[PDB]
Amino acid sequence: LNSINTNAGAMIALQNLNGTNSELTTVQQRINTGKKIASAKDNGAIWATAKNQ
């Protein structure tokens, strides 16, 4: 299919790039705080345990 209107391969490469940027942003946060769970979004149970403790 030599489509002129649609290009699924660029879509696949873009979603893969977005996932790579997500992991890189996670590592950037993880280096900033120096903490594996910097907030409740990281994992709420151990986060609340650490807060009360």
Place this chain on the structure above:
Amino acid sequence: LNSINTNAGAMIALQNLNGTNSELTTVQQRINTGKKIASAKDNGAIWATAKNQ
């Protein structure tokens, strides 16, 4: 037959030329629109499915 009032062979050649011209126009639409089904005139069911999707 040498009938001066009529020439059926030119009529048949004109019919063939008209069919070749109509095929050239539909290919012209396929080239500029970039789609094999760009309107309801082409195929209405798949076109309506494409519009809804």
